[PDB]
């Protein structure tokens, strides 16, 4: 009887399929003829955008190993192209069919398809993706509507992608939301560009949750009164975070819009604008939108009749052309029958690590955990290794499953606490998830096993990407030592990250928040590096309109909008005139570290930071009750 059935093959499943081939496990893939959202975007011609995520975190270790020279943002085209390549390799093993039902028994499951064909499989893996409502807007659109008005009850990376495509057609944007978390996807660090994922040094949570919290959460929670931070100038972006009942920060369930800030966007693309836009590099700067008023925030309770289709803001009644609601992070699970009769009720919190469900035998989920920053690759690679070991190594299987529900309770206690289940429970800091998975599999690193400060940087500051845990051990990939050398050598061994955590070791949360924003340009939501790009923005529009064959008649006065903008930006007009250090501390920190790279750690004698750097071999907060 068939050992393994993979239902659905897009991207999530590639690494697990690679691992099955390797160990020569008997597997079949069943996967729809239609394909995914991407084959949509391929047919309609709509691949004209780029990922919010860096190569290093969006593409799998066994590709990075040969294609990685420098950090870039891949295009939707490059990402689709990489799916069709791995599709091609495995097409012989793929059955084109839709599965409509799985009857799960003690030893195996019975898979029904639309064809009517039936399959028996010992283990089954669902890698079927999500149904998403804005896919419609993204797959089906028209860049001919201009000067119209749009209301969004929700903000997110797809809402942001659509706002990027509207603004050049002098469309007017209103966000009627309960606020949102948005973060510069790229950060100038002493001249060098870093992705946001590259600066989280997540293993610092082991030193203390509180150390990590104040290092991490100042751009999210409004803990600075610095009037350059969008959350002080535009207080409507603020969310209620009272649901958060966990010592883990950032908390599971936190989501974030990743945007290009204009200055980073300038730096990368100014010298060949028409081509870079052509390729799908699009200015999606929400902070710039808020500052120009090409977008405006509005209280959530700003009533409107959907029937007359108008918006009640200030002493104005603006007729809106389109209202956009959107939230469908619901996995595409076909019906699953327990003991082959009782329907299975999906709930992210009731599965272990987002992969192991509780009343089902030999059934795995792959592609349903959402990384909070970085690409899905990071998550799906480690899921792939966790699932492969569970399928192929029955002692491992027994170890996890013995006390499956104790692990799930202990997981939920650490990450969610007492909070009621939410839509976004399935979102997680990637740096915690990957480390979590790796300590279950045992391909993790020991801090006690560091001998040099160089080793202490690898452990704490090297980002917890999937390939990080594939240098050696059970899942070692050829060429990973070279990747780590490459990357290490390009980011100064992630010293700057290590130095941050050091700098804020003695501060309280309010002290850290201030320090974190005492920079000429702080990392996230810095409204001082906006005004001086209005000249460039004008280039960008003209430039955009050329590749995309647009005329917009740009002398028009939406006079009421100009007055809606003025009322919206009130707090701004009060607070931004109050304008006027991490830069220095970091400058001297990097000095100390790059000098003592090769010093034995235990040897270290007794700026008094050396004593904390010793204690880095023996962290207090390593305990994870869901792993032991």
Ligand X SMILES: NC(=O)c1ccc[n+]([C@@H]2O[C@H](COP(=O)([O-])OP(=O)(O)OC[C@H]3O[C@@H](n4cnc5c(N)ncnc54)[C@H](OP(=O)(O)O)[C@@H]3O)[C@@H](O)[C@H]2O)c1
Ligand Y SMILES: Cc1cc2nc3c(=O)[nH]c(=O)nc-3n(C[C@H](O)[C@H](O)[C@H](O)COP(=O)(O)OP(=O)(O)OC[C@H]3O[C@@H](n4cnc5c(N)ncnc54)[C@H](O)[C@@H]3O)c2cc1C
Residue whose C-alpha is closest to residue 624's, from 250, 247, 354, 245: 247
- Residue tagged 């064909």 (tokens): 117
Work out whether strand 130-131 and strand 330-331 pair parallel, antiparallel, or are unpaired: antiparallel
Which of 219, 250, 357, 371 lies at the binding interface for ligand X (CB under 6 A)?
Answer: 371
Q: How far apart are CA 597 and CA 542, in angstroms?
A: 49
Examine residue 132 and tell whether it contacts ligand X (CB under 6 A): yes
Chain breaks in the chain (C to N over 2.5 A) after: 580, 606
In the bound state, the residue with its beta carbon closest to ligand Y is 10
Contact 360, 243 (CB under 8 A): no
Cα end-to-end span (Å), the chain: 34
How many residues in the shown chain lie near ligand Y by CB under 6 A?
A: 30
83 is in an annotated binding site: no
The binder of 34, among ligand Y, ligand X, none, by C-beta within 5 to 8 A per type, is ligand Y
Closer residue to ligand X (CB): 375 or 447: 375
Q: Scanning residues 284 to 343, which ones bind ligand Y (CB under 6 A)?
A: 332, 334
Which of 6, 17, 65, 127 lies at the binding interface for ligand Y (CB under 6 A)?
Answer: 127
Closer residue to ligand X (CB): 60 or 626: 60
Q: Residues 6 or more apart from 513 whose CB is under 8 A from it? A: 214, 218, 223, 224
What are the φ and ψ backbone dihedral angles of 314, each rounded to 5 degrees? Answer: 65, -140
Examine residue 53 and tell whether it contacts ligand Y (CB under 6 A): yes
Kindly report the number of other CB atoms within 10 A of residue 8's CB atom. 23
481 is in an annotated binding site: yes
Contact 382, 389 (CB under 8 A): no
99 is in an annotated binding site: yes
Q: Scanning residues 220 to 239, which ones bind ligand X (CB under 6 A)?
A: 239
Q: How far apart are CA 627 and CA 618, in angstroms?
A: 19
Q: How far is CA 86 from CA 79, 95, 102, 377, 454, in A?
A: 11, 15, 26, 14, 36
Examine residue 7 and tell whether it contacts ligand Y (CB under 6 A): yes
The binder of 181, among ligand X, ligand Y, none, by C-beta within 5 to 8 A per type, is ligand X
Q: At closest approach, how far in Å is the CB of 337 from ligand Y?
A: 15
Which of 36, 78, 160, 523 lies at the binding interface for ligand Y (CB under 6 A)?
Answer: 36
How many residues in the shown chain lie near ligand X by CB under 6 A?
A: 26
Which of 61, 128, 464, 525 lies at the binding interface for ligand Y (CB under 6 A)?
Answer: 128
Examine residue 302 and tell whether it contacts ligand X (CB under 6 A): no
Residue whose C-alpha is closest to residue 466's, from 177, 119, 60, 156: 60
Which of 4, 5, 6, 10 lies at the binding interface for ligand Y (CB under 6 A)?
Answer: 10
Q: Scanning residues 167 to 196, which ones bind ligand X (CB under 6 A)?
A: 177-178, 180-181
424 is in an annotated binding site: yes
Kindly report the number of other CB atoms within 10 A of residue 565's CB atom. 17
The binder of 357, among ligand Y, ligand X, none, by C-beta within 5 to 8 A per type, is none
Closer residue to ligand Y (CB): 100 or 578: 100
572 is in an annotated binding site: no
Work out whether strand 109-113 and strand 99-104 pair parallel, antiparallel, or are unpaired: antiparallel
Examine residue 156 and tell whether it contacts ligand X (CB under 6 A): yes
Which of 4, 5, 134, 287 lies at the binding interface for ligand X (CB under 6 A)?
Answer: 134
Q: Residues 6 or more apart from 564 whose CB is under 8 A from it? A: 174, 296, 313, 314, 316, 318
Question: Both tokens of residue 108?
Answer: 């195996």
**Contact set with ligand Y (CB under 6 A):** 7-8, 10-12, 30-32, 34-37, 51-53, 58, 98-99, 127-129, 132, 138, 158, 332, 334, 367, 375-377
**Contact set with ligand X (CB under 6 A):** 52-53, 132, 134, 153-159, 177-178, 180-181, 239, 254-255, 326-327, 329, 370-371, 375-376, 424
**Which positions make up the binding site for Ca(2+)?**
481-482
**Which positions make up the binding site for NADP(+)?**
132, 155, 158-159, 178, 181, 239, 255, 370, 424
């Amino acid at each position: 009887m068939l050992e393994v059935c993979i239902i659905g093959f897009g991207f999530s499943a590639i690494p697990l399929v690679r691992e099955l081939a390797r160990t020569q496990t008997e597997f079949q893939i069943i996967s729809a003829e239609s394909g995914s959202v991407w084959d949509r975007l391929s047919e309609s011609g709509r691949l004209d955008f780029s990922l919010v995520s860096s190569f290093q975190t969006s593409f799998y270790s066994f590709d990075l190993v040969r294609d990685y020279e420098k950090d870039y943002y891949p295009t939707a085209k490059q990402f689709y192209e990489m799916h069709e390549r791995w599709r091609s390799v495995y097409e012989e093993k793929i059955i084109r069919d839709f599965v409509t039902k799985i009857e799960n028994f003690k030893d195996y499951s019975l898979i029904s398809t639309r064809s009517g064909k039936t399959y028996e499989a010992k283990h089954v893996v669902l890698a079927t993706g999500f149904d998403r409502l804005m896919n419609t807007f993204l797959s089906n659109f028209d860049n001919h509507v201009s000067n119209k008005t749009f209301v969004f009850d929700t903000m997110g990376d797809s809402a942001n992608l659509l706002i990027a495509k509207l603004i050049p057609n002098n469309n007017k944007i209103i966000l009627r939301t309960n606020g949102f978390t948005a973060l510069d996807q790229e950060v100038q660090v002493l001249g060098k560009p870093f992705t946001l994922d590259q600066l989280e040094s997540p293993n610092f949570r082991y030193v203390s949750s509180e150390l990590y919290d104040r290092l991490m959460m100042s751009p999210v929670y409004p803990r600075t009164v610095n009037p350059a931070v969008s959350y002080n100038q535009f207080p409507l972006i603020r969310r209620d975070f009272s649901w958060v009942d966990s010592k883990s920060s950032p908390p599971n369930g936190l989501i974030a819009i990743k945007y290009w800030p204009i200055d980073q966007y300038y730096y990368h693309f100014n010298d060949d604008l028409e081509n870079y836009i052509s390729k799908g590099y699009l200015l999606n700067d929400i902070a710039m939108w808020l500052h120009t008023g090409k977008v405006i925030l509005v209280p959530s309770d700003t009533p409107i009749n959907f029937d007359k289709k108008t918006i009640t803001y200030a002493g104005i009644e603006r007729s809106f052309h389109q209202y956009v609601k959107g939230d469908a992070e619901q996995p595409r699970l076909p019906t699953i029958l327990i003991n082959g009769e009782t329907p299975f009720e999906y709930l992210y919190r009731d599965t272990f690590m987002g992969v192991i469900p509780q009343r089902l035998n030999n059934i795995y989920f792959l592609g349903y955990t959402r990384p909070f920053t970085g690409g899905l690759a990071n998550i799906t690679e480690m899921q792939s290794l966790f699932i492969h070991k569970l399928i192929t190594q029955p002692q491992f299987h027994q170890k996890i499953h013995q006390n499956l529900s104790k692990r799930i309770t202990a997981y939920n206690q650490h990450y969610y606490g007492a909070a009621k289940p939410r839509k976004h429970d399935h979102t997680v800091p990637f740096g915690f998830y990957t480390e979590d998975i790796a300590r279950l599999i045992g391909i993790h690193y020991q801090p006690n096993e560091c001998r040099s400060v160089r080793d202490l940087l690898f452990y704490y500051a090297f980002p917890n990407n999937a390939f990080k845990y594939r240098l050696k051990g059970e899942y070692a990939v050829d060429g990973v030592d070279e990747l780590i050398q490459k990357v290490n050598d390009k980011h100064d061994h992630y010293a700057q990250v290590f130095v941050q955590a050091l700098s804020i070791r003695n501060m309280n949360s309010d002290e850290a928040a201030e320090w974190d924003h005492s920079a000429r340009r702080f990392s996230f939501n810095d409204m001082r590096h906006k005004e001086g790009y209005r000249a460039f923005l004008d280039t960008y529009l003209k430039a955009y309109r050329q590749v995309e064959n647009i005329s917009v008649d740009d002398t028009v006065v939406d006079e009421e909008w100009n007055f809606m903008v003025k009322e919206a930006c009130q707090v701004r007009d009060k607070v931004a005139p109050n304008i006027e250090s991490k830069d220095e501390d970091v400058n001297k920190g990097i000095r100390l570290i790059l000098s003592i790279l090769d010093s034995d750690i235990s040897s270290l004698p007794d700026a008094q930071s050396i004593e904390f750097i010793r204690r880095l071999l023996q962290p207090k907060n390593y305990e994870l009750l869901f792993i032991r």
